[PDB]
Amino acid sequence: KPKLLYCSNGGHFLRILPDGTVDGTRDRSDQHIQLQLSAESVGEVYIKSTETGQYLAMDTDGLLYGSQTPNEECLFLERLEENHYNTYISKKHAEKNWFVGLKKNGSCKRGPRTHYGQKAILFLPLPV
C-alpha cells in the first residue's frame, strides 16, 4: 500500500517532483508525495512516486533525484530508529553513511551533509 514519508526535521512529506527534483512539502494534498515502497530484500526498499512512476535515488555525489527507471542508485536500506522513525541510507553509498534527508526548509540535504543523529534523516512512514 502507498504511504507518505514525513520528515520530523521540518515537518515535510518527502516529494518527488516531475522534473526529477526531490524536496519536501507540508501540503498533504500534493499528488507527488504518495510513495509506494517495495522491498527487494528484507530492509532494502525502492521508493516510488505513484503519480509519476519515478524512483527516489541518490547520485555519486550524494544528490537526491527522481529516477525514471529503477537502478542500483534507487536501493535504500530502511532502518528503524530508537524513536520508531525510519532512516533511509543509500545502499550504493552505505559505506559513506549517505542518508536521505530534508532540511528544515524542505530542501533536500546532500548525502555528505548528513549523518546519524540528525533530525533531517528521520522519516515516519504513514500508510495512506
Curated annotation (Swiss-Prot):
Effect seen on changing residue 109 to A: Loss of LRRC59-binding
Tissue/organ expression: Predominantly expressed in kidney and brain. Detected at much lower levels in heart and skeletal muscle.
Spans annotated as Heparin-binding: 103-119
Biological processes, Gene Ontology terms: activation of protein kinase B activity; anatomical structure morphogenesis; angiogenesis; branch elongation involved in ureteric bud branching; cellular response to heat; epithelial cell proliferation; fibroblast growth factor receptor signaling pathway; lung development
Description of post-translational modifications: In the nucleus, phosphorylated by PKC/PRKCD.
Effect the entry attributes to changing residue 9 to A: No effect on integrin-binding
Compartments where located: Secreted; Cytoplasm; Cytoplasm, Cell cortex; Cytoplasm, Cytosol
Effect on the protein upon substituting residue 103 to E: Reduced integrin-binding. Defective in integrin-, heparin- and FGFR1-binding, and defective in inducing FGF1 signaling, cell proliferation and cell migration
Annotated coiled-coil segments of the chain: none
Disulphide bond pairs: none
Keywords: Acetylation, Angiogenesis, Cytoplasm, Developmental protein, Differentiation, Growth factor, Heparin-binding, Mitogen, Nucleus, Phosphoprotein, Secreted
An MF annotation (GO) of this entry: integrin binding
GO annotations of cellular component type: cell cortex; cytoplasm; cytosol; extracellular matrix; extracellular region; extracellular space; nucleoplasm; nucleus
Residues annotated for heparin binding in this entry: 9
Role noted for this protein: Plays an important role in the regulation of cell survival, cell division, angiogenesis, cell differentiation and cell migration. Functions as a potent mitogen in vitro. Acts as a ligand for FGFR1 and integrins. Binds to FGFR1 in the presence of heparin leading to FGFR1 dimerization and activation via sequential autophosphorylation on tyrosine residues which act as docking sites for interacting proteins, leading to the activation of several signaling cascades. Binds to integrin ITGAV:ITGB3.
Family per record: Belongs to the heparin-binding growth factors family.
The protein's assembly and partners: Monomer. Homodimer. Interacts with FGFR1, FGFR2, FGFR3 and FGFR4. Affinity between fibroblast growth factors (FGFs) and their receptors is increased by heparan sulfate glycosaminoglycans that function as coreceptors. Found in a complex with FGFBP1, FGF1 and FGF2. Interacts with FGFBP1. Part of a Cu(2+)-dependent multiprotein aggregate containing FGF1, S100A13 and SYT1. Interacts with SYT1. Interacts with S100A13. Interacts with LRRC59. Interacts with CSNKA, CSNKB and FIBP. While binding with LRRC59, CSNKA and FIBP seem mutually exclusive, CSNKB and FIBP may cooperatively interact with FGF1.
Name recorded for this polypeptide: Fibroblast growth factor 1
Organism: Homo sapiens (Human)
Gene: FGF1
